[PDB]
Design a protein around this ligand. Sequence first.
Ligand SMILES: [Ca+2]
Ligand SMILES: [Ca+2]
Ligand SMILES: [Ca+2]
Length: 1346
Amino acid sequence: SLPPVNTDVHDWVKTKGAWDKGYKGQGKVVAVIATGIDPAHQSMRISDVSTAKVKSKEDMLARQKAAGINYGSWINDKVVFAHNYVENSDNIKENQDTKYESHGMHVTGIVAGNSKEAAATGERFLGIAPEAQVMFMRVFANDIMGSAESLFIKAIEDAVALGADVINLSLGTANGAQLSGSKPLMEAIEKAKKAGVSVVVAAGNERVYGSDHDDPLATNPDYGLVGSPSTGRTPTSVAAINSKWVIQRLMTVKELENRADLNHGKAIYSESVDFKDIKDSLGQFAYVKESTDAGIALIERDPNKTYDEMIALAKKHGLGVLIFNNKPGQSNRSMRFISHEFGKAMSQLNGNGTGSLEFDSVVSKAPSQKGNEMNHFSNWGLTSDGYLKPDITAPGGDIYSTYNDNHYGSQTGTAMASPQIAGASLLVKQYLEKTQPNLPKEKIADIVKNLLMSNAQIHVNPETKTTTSPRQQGAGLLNIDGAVTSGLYVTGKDNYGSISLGNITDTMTFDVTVHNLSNKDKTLRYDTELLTDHVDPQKGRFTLTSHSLKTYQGGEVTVPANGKVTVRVTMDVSQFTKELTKQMPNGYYLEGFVRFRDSQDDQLNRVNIPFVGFKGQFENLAVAEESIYRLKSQGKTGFYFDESGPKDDIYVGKHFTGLVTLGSETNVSTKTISDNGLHTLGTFKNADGKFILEKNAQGNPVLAISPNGDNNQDFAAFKGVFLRKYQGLKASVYHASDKEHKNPLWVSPESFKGDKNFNSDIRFAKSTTLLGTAFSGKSLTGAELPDGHYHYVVSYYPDVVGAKRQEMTFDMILDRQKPVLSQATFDPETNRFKPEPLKDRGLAGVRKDSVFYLERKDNKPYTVTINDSYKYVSVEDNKTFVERQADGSFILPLDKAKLGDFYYMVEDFAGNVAIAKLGDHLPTPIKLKLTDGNYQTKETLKDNLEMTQSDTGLVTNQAQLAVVHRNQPQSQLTKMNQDFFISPNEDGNKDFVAFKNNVYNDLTVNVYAKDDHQKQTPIWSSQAGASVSAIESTAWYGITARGSKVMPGDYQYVVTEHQKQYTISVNDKKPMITQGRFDTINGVDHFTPDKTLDSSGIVREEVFYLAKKNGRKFDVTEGITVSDNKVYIPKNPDGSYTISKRDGVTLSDYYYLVEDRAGNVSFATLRDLKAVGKDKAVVNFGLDLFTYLVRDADGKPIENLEYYNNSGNSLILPYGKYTVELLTYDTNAAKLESDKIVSFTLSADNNFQQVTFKITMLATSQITAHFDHLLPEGSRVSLKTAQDQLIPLEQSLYVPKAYGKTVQEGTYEVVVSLPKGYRIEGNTKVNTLPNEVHELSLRLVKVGDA
Ligand SMILES: [Ca+2]
Ligand SMILES: [Ca+2]
Ligand SMILES: [Ca+2]
């Protein structure tokens, strides 16, 4: 009578086994944290509310009051609680086939669907736990805060507090660590486990390292991408397998209805990125078979001719393009007029004649072409710190579940596999509460997981016929019946359902424990299967399939009733070492399963445990791919490097480990107003515009910089292809002579951490540039390091405790000296210009010499290029080069230009350019003197000041900041006799403080913080040779000696029997523009801005409109300067500005500009300020060094939010008393210092309120205690906090002598308690630094009583 239950998944995962025992999920609650839900769906129902946890709306209201939750609502007997956490509302339904799509709804159907009504297959669809209640937390990623981790934490805490049994979380970041995830998220998950809550999370959908590019290289075995928080020990990580059955629109051939091997005449068909089958049919067609692709079309796929040329041929001959595969048994290809592909076997019988064809509109069941195969995108292990994740597998590919408005659809992902496990966890919890009632809250989540893992069914790849890797499937495929029928689970030393062995040498030895929850003894027979990765011998890449090595018999073991037994598994793996070390030279995985079964019958008591070890040193595998310079000299190739283009082309957008720098062209006719962007260090532009890694006379490349301020090769920064997650990355400089790298001359002020360049899709980068590692040729004290041979060293660590520090050394030259131009000969007979043989002044060496003249185009020797897309202006010399002859001479074309109009240019490998204009020394070869015309030089700031007695002597820069154009505006020097405030942002306006009929000697400029009254320690000081003539030597740009920007605040700038002290405030906070007022007098509009110490004071106001010219809001004029098309409006005597109508100017074209005392500029559209009514007020909320709720005078939250000047943190409100409550903020990166609740009153007198939440920023560090020898049995290592708390440290998995943790920045002490007879020698104290790794080397010293 009632429709049949679809069992496509249920027969596979064995759900009936628990359902028959009475475990359907009644009395349980599942919290689904997802995108959206339709709580009205026919599936969202329970059979009996008498046995349910939340019996009514009143029961939930009581739960809310007791939990302190004054939001969210009960919806029905199934959806007992819902809230939208992003928007803070009860708008829980999404997307209000694509029309009804809802990820969250799909997910909810899988765990707890309970439809009474039949879907399109004629079957009703049920979830794993159909009688369970649902809690729905609507949380998702948004532009304002991408992670939304803080909202997911609050949702987790709510679910636990309101009474959930299981939580299904889709949140995730690839390559998760087990022991170093975010502190508030890991704490929230740990409080859930303590409450008896199972936390179920998808593994992710990124496959392995390089999945969007190619298979990983056999030399790079750390390719795991399993995501965080699933990589946490507490959550259950879920991998996905493809369903054996698919429900979709198929293709029917009624004559082939008698073929049960061909799904009774129904076929699966595929299309490319563009779908055009709608234009062909909806819901009969005669087809015709073709044998040749030469002169509906039924055709066999051709390996020679493309899909395009097969389709085109069918159009020319006459209906449709039904392409059938040439490979038997193969799934349909992605093909990338109407066309579609389908199976070979299906068309071997379609091919036999001519007849019927019909594309069905309604979905139908079909066996999957890729069924019982691990999903291609399912995330593999290991964990970034080397633990075995994921934990288990469940069907996630082609899952048919609930969509909006009683609809249904198919979706693929670990996100569909996750609710299978969430549902199963509800049934196992219900089973343990009945059968093990004394098992406490705090222990139940670990046992639910252990039963599901041990009773899981081990997958065998149906193609290779080999056991799927534990790193891909985990413990195996979900078996619900086994987890509720057997009373058995398997554990290792750690008390977990899987074993992570650490490093392997010649032997694998581990202890396996079987637990019996039943009243009778069980005799099990066991064997262990050993596997490794299969490598393609032709490509030297991992195939991501396994190789079975050996099966070891273990014999029989008896597991006592209500008890446990422990066995030892020993395996000598040395016999395989030679063969496998050849294939995988940097080490390889040794993994598999210990399989237990009943000694009497094969079918009963099938329980198992996955294990994984690494043969080698997992902790010391390369973090960064070898440099492009080193790869090129060995003839090797990088994983992501594009080898196309000319020989040795290293275009900077390519993906490699190397050094980058900024280029700036040298012009001869005008000044350079723009740089050329970044380029690869050691590469130079050829005649075709391509950057080539050029060689010196010795055939080696040269890495050299010229830090002289001309913006051409001034610095060198690290760029890397990261193979593994890294931490504590920094750059350091040494003398080339300092081979041991003992005396650092300069260290990057900051340290870095980040992800491996996994490149799962186009959004994930294949390489990372770290501009923070830039070396500009200055020491730690900011002194100029002299020209010479240095070593630029990039050091970093893997995310594995005990790993050795890794480093990449680059030989680098500092050379600030232009090459030598002296003499040349010129032969009037042949026009031969012969310069003196090439010589460089410095160590870099001359790379190229050239000759050019200036081509006059449009009566100018230069070209002004206007890039409207970036609103940028470029100016370039029209350089026309003369060919260099084999003997190094040049034949000057005198018809093109006169002898005196030729330039001779010499450039070194460091970026130093010498240019001589032939003709500066002009009135058979005639001798000709050459000198550089100083064309390449550091720009100099306009100094047209005269210092009078009244002046303080303090100088600064001034520049008009742009609204439209992106060119660096003209800046000039100005006096600072008032408003001693600076904005160190290098925009040309008040960026620094400097000192200018007198004479000064021993000039000494020093800067000290506010409280340094005794002048004890300067933060910055001037460099040896400071003069009143050169303002650069005394200019302080709001930085430390190490080059870091000083924090906002006041400072002592003191010039030195004379000592001139001056207090300078630093602030780059943009001014906050208020709405002002608008009035219409005699038809003409009027704008009256609001009248305004602390650097927020306004020094100048502007009102203007941007007059559009030549399709742009900016103009370029020949001095060459770039300007905005600003038409100014004068201030009226009362204080207003007349916004008089102009023939083509609107209010959105008008602006109000303000400059503060610090030189920070803000501007706003007049139409934006006008959006606030004459009666309304504005409030702004911010953090100073998130989600908020505003309530009216009554206490009712505000509705119909009105946003001011395009800010989601600025609200337009009527007058009245209000309250603001800070609800969430990232507790991981920030700490709140002020009140969460703020009262503010908006009125006519106070029509603009600023409300700030004072926050302190948080940083992390890594501490590792590394010992001499292994610590004796009984030793405890912990870290002592400044607040007297002890953090227990555990022996690292890969480095047993090391103990470490990722901690918040602060002071710590390594505490060690040893048995009698030992002492620890060495420092235990550490003052940790941001993103830094602190290694503590300690000695275990034997001791005796005196
Ligand atoms: Ca330079
Ligand atoms: Ca040089
Ligand atoms: Ca500035």
